[PDB]
């Protein structure tokens, strides 16, 4: 999904709000901040109502201005609440009644997702690959800065996971794939307009094809 969450390479932001080794304070800066993660795990592990991938996607589905103005932990409160309503576990009425005011949620999905592809390639360390030049309106774990770009395999995972583009929509056809650490030269991604060396992206097998 080409949403505002796909932030890598966006220009115009100011300073990162941190000096190295500065005190970051407590893990939680408010008494509610542990709730989004803990209730997410209740949903995933105890209820089996959704996957972690669905949590990422429902946050991607926040209305774009809403995403941009909402602090981190609050996005997950909104996301987990949205999933509970979409899965029929909760109603928006009861959330707003208990909250004593408006509790707007993420927008409905505009894609049913896609299955794990049947045709993929097992790549080896040192092999040159290109990121498939594909556009996916639902959940995908490929940041747009690498779409269509060429890099080198530095690692093939020894484990496999469900394809995010499927499990992120709660589909039954996510299969399993390993991922690949793909190293890109900075100039491959941003031309002359970068001060970096290389960028390594952890990409599912189904996002890749042999280079040329």
């Amino acid at each position: 999904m080409d949403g505002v969450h796909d932030l890598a390479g966006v220009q115009g932001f100011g300073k990162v709000p941190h000096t190295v080794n500065a005190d970051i304070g407590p893990t939680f800066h408010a008494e509610w901040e542990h709730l989004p993660y803990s209730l997410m795990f209740a949903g995933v592990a105890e209820l089996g109502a959704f996957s972690v991938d669905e949590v990422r996607y429902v946050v991607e589905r926040m209305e774009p201005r809403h995403y941009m103005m909402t602090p981190y932990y609050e996005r997950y409160v909104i996301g987990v609440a949205t999933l509970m309503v979409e899965k029929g576990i909760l109603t928006q009425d009861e959330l707003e009644s208990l909250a004593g005011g408006p509790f707007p949620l993420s927008r409905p999905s505009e894609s049913e997702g896609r299955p794990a592809p049947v045709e993929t390639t097992t790549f080896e360390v040192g092999q040159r690959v290109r990121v498939r030049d594909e556009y996916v309106p639902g959940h995908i774990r490929m940041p747009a800065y690498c779409r269509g770009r060429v890099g080198t395999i530095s690692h093939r995972t020894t484990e496999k996971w469900p394809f995010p583009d499927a499990i992120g929509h709660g589909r039954n056809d996510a299969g399993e794939e390993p991922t690949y650490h793909v190293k890109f030269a900075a100039e491959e991604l941003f031309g002359s307009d970068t001060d970096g060396g290389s960028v390594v992206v952890d990409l599912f097998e189904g996002y890749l094809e042999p280079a040329a």
Binding site: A8, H34, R56, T194, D195
Partner: protein, 197 residues
């Protein structure tokens, strides 16, 4: 008009979500409290510091950590949520590694702790992939001009830690002494371990 929705206070919404689920028997007794304790007390960069100090003093462990990070971490019992498949990336005299999750906040929770506000910021998510040298500089870390920077974007299930270079002036230090200078920011890759004067 680019308007934003009027919203109840976030604390009220978060606790509403808790109460709605809990009131339906969907949240076990002591469940969120248990997680809060794990997040605050167990998931900690002290664990990653321990792993770095071990690698620095034990060539055999160093090799294991860099080839099978998951196995090395398991030896300490530090695998966990958002830290099940671990890769440690090695800094060298010619290479500085830095970790981000440009798409959200993905972090090796059990060994680095939950991510800090700055790491999850739009500023870091947007900029470090494209201009890591300037970002580190602004944060107080000057990377020598003759050192390459490599940014790992945490886009799937690999969860990363940086193994920084061991600074001169620490020769013969105990593991405890070494652990002290391996900070959370060293593990993320934005800081270099510092030796006091």
């Amino acid at each position: 008009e680019n308007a934003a929705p009027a919203q109840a206070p976030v604390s009220d919404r978060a606790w509403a979500l808790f109460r709605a689920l809990d009131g339906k028997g969907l949240v076990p007794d002591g469940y969120v409290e248990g997680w809060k304790k794990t997040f605050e007390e167990d998931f900690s960069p002290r664990r990653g510091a321990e792993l770095v100090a071990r690698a620095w003093t034990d060539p055999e462990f160093r090799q294991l950590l860099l080839t099978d990070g998951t196995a090395a971490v398991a030896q300490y019992g530090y695998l966990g949520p958002q830290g099940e498949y671990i890769v440690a990336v090695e800094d060298t005299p010619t290479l500085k590694n830095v970790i981000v999750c440009s798409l959200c906040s993905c972090t090796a929770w059990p060994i680095l702790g939950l991510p800090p506000t700055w790491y999850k910021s739009f500023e870091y998510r947007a900029r470090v992939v494209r201009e890591p040298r300037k970002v580190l500089s602004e944060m107080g870390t000057e990377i020598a001009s003759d050192i390459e920077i490599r940014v790992y974007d945490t886009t799937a299930e690999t969860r990363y830690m940086v193994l920084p270079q061991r600074p001169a002036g620490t020769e013969g230090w105990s593991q405890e002494q070494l652990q002290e200078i391996v900070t959370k920011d060293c593990l993320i890759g934005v800081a270099i371990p510092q030796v006091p004067t």
